[PDB]
Amino acid sequence: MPAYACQRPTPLTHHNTGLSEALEILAEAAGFEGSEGRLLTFCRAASVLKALPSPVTTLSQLQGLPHFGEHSSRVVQELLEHGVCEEVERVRRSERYQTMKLFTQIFGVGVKTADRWYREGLRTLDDLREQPQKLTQQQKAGLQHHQDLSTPVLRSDVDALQQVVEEAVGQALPGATVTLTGGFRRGKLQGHDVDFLITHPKEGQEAGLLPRVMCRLQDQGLILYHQHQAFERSFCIFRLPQPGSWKAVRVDLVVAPVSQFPFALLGWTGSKLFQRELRRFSRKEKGLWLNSHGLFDPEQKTFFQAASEEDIFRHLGLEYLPPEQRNA
DNA sequence: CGGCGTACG
DNA sequence: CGTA
DNA sequence: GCCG
Ligand SMILES: Nc1ccn([C@@H]2O[C@H](COP(=O)(O)CP(=O)(O)OP(=O)(O)O)[C@@H](O)[C@H]2O)c(=O)n1
Ligand SMILES: [Cl-]
Ligand SMILES: [Cl-]
Ligand SMILES: [Cl-]
Ligand SMILES: [Cl-]
Ligand SMILES: [Mg+2]
Ligand SMILES: [Mg+2]
Ligand code: NA
């Protein structure tokens, strides 16, 4: 079992679901307390279990697995012995965990804001709604639409949405393309949002594209919220049709030049942990700096000109993983 | 012990 | 600060 | 919290 998640295939569904869920609760709780190192270890340990070929049934099967030390091993041991881990259950039922989870789930609220509200004594969404002068416009939209945004986006919703985006994109810039990325490209059947990557086959034509796209979507009445109602990423709330009505859904749009498209596609297809691990691997094992724009050799001061995701994996000395195996 | 991904709005 |  |  290699130490980096980008070195091993991780499928969407696996053989250790309950164990990984429990470790991800501890990871999440670590993040709510600002303990980024512990969050990473618990996320990595959970991801190792997702990559195993069969269920863990005995503690000895953790021997030699990376990212399993005394703490994560004890969590697994208790789950194996009793079906429950006391530390995990104590987190689950704690007021701090439940409120931080509720608040950070709001679009426009991060850990730092949630924590401040928590220390001010706030606990429920209706607490926040009662003091709306404390809220940014982004947070007001996230709170108003919170109920719809808490319901999963279905993969069967995505194609109709993509067609609507493609219509606006084609009027903004004929020939520009829309590619589904994020969790749905990794094979998820449901998601929290839809992530689209936009480009154009003629380098430079994509300059200034996203404002034109957003203005067209807003003119069609489809945008319930966006930040601009020059930029290259938009985080918006979209009106999605429903039987006799509609629902709010989160849609992310990003524009990249076609020269960068492999890097952007890789960078936006995820998972989030896979990307963190891939960039850590690149820098720490290969001495190369990776982001969603490119891959930089700081000694030569040169950028690698990739034509595909396959190119990028090869340049990093990694076996290619299709999106479905990037579910770290 | 240091390090923990890297951007954009 | 928020967002991916 | 864990790895190198
Ligand atoms: N911090 C981050 C957050 C996001 N990303 C990248 O952005 C993509 C969409 O994130 P996203 O937030 O839409 C989560 P997704 O994987 O699509 O599943 P979901 O929407 O059903 O929950 C991820 O797959 C990563 O490639 C990242 O590199 N670093
Ligand atoms: Cl920490
Ligand atoms: Cl409607
Ligand atoms: Cl590609
Ligand atoms: Cl980036
Ligand atoms: Mg997504
Ligand atoms: Mg997204
Ligand atoms: Na949030």
Domain boundaries, given as residue ranges, for chain A = 1-94, 95-151, 152-258, 259-327
Instruction: Residue A279: name the closest of A265, A256, A296 by CA.
Output: A296
- Whether A1-94 shares its CATH topology with A95-151 is answered yes
Rounded CA-CA distance A223/A214 in Å is 8
Rounded CA-CA distance A214/A221 in Å is 11
A69-74: which pairs have CB atoms within 8 A and are 24 or more residues apart? Answer: A72/A23, A72/A41, A72/A42, A72/A45
Residues 6+ apart with CB under 8 A from A264: A197, A199, A254, A256, A292, A293
- For residue A271, whether the previous peptide bond is cis, meaning omega lies within 30 degrees of 0, is yes
Q: Which nucleotide is nearest to A293 (CA to C1')?
A: B7
Rounded CA-CA distance A22/A199 in Å is 39
- Gap sites in chain A (C to N > 2.5 Å), preceding residue numbers: 229
Rounded CA-CA distance A190/A187 in Å is 9
Test site for ligand 1: of A195, A197, A237, most ligand atoms within 8 A of the Cβ: A195
Residue A286 is encoded by which pair of tokens?
Answer: 């290969």
Residues 6+ apart with CB under 8 A from A126: none
Distances (CA, A) of A216 to A141, A179, A254: 20, 18, 16
Rounded CA-CA distance A217/A219 in Å is 5
Q: Is A177 helix (H, G, I), strand (E, B) or coil?
A: strand
Give the method of determination. Answer: X-ray
Q: What's the CA angle centered on A91, arms A89 and A96, to 5 degrees?
A: 145
Locate tokens 């340049």: which residue? A315
**Cβ atoms of A144 and A248 closer than 8 Å:** no
Rounded CA-CA distance A251/A164 in Å is 12
- In CATH terms, the fold of domain A259-327 is Beta Polymerase; domain 3 (3.30.210)
Expressed in angstroms and rounded, the spacing between residue A55 Cα and the centre of ligand 4 is 33
Does residue A294's CB lie within 6 angstroms of at least one atom of ligand 1?
Answer: no
CATH of domain A1-94: 1.10.150.110
Rounded CA-CA distance A269/A278 in Å is 12
Q: Which residue of the set A148, A252, A297, A311 is catalytic?
A: A252
Q: Which nucleotides on chain D have any atom < 7 A from a protein Cβ?
A: 1-4
Instruction: Residue A107: name the closest of A241, A227, A6, A258 by CA.
Output: A227
Rounded CA-CA distance A94/A306 in Å is 48
Expressed in angstroms and rounded, the spacing between residue A262 Cα and the centre of ligand 4 is 5
- Tell me, what amino acid is at A4? Y
Distances (CA, A) of A23 to A68, A132, A153, A273: 11, 35, 25, 14
Alpha-carbon torsion A307, A312, A315, A319, what sign? Answer: negative
Residue A265 is encoded by which pair of tokens?
Answer: 């596609």
Between the CA of A57 and the C1' of C1, what is the distance in angstroms?
45
| CATH homologous superfamily for the domain A152-258 | Beta Polymerase, domain 2 (3.30.460.10)
Residue with the nearest Cα to atom 23 of ligand 1?
A270
Q: Does domain A95-151 have CATH number 1.10.150.20?
A: yes
Q: What's the CA angle centered on A89, arms A84 and A95, to 5 degrees?
A: 170
Residue A4 is encoded by which pair of tokens?
Answer: 């980096």
Between the CA of A305 and the C1' of D1, what is the distance in angstroms?
37
Give residue A45's Cα distance to chain centre: 18
Rounded CA-CA distance A208/A231 in Å is 7
Does residue A275's CB lie within 6 angstroms of at least one atom of ligand 1?
Answer: yes
Instruction: Residue A51: name the closest of A38, A39, A67 by CA.
Output: A67
Residue with the nearest Cα to atom 6 of ligand 1?
A268
Expressed in angstroms and rounded, the spacing between residue A310 Cα and the centre of ligand 4 is 7
DSSP annotation of A53? S
Element (H, E) at A253: strand A245-255
Expressed in angstroms and rounded, the spacing between residue A169 Cα and the centre of ligand 3 is 21
Alpha-carbon torsion A180, A185, A191, A195, what sign? Answer: negative
Does residue A270's CB lie within 6 angstroms of at least one atom of ligand 1?
Answer: yes
Locate tokens 């007021």: which residue? A95
**Which parts of chain A fold into alpha helices (H)?**
17-32, 36-50, 70-82, 86-92, 95-104, 111-119, 125-130, 137-144, 146-149, 155-172, 182-185, 209-219, 261-269, 272-286, 309-315
Residue with the nearest Cα to atom 7 of ligand 1?
A268
Rounded CA-CA distance A39/A32 in Å is 9
Q: At what angle do helices A70-82 and A17-32 cross, to 10 degrees?
A: 130
Rounded CA-CA distance A282/A270 in Å is 15
Is the Cβ atom of A125 within 7 Å of strand C at any atom? no
| Length in residues, chain A | 328
Q: Which atom of ligand 1 is nearest to the CA of A152?
A: 21
Buried b (16+ CB within 10 A) or exposed e, A165-178: beebbeebbeebbb
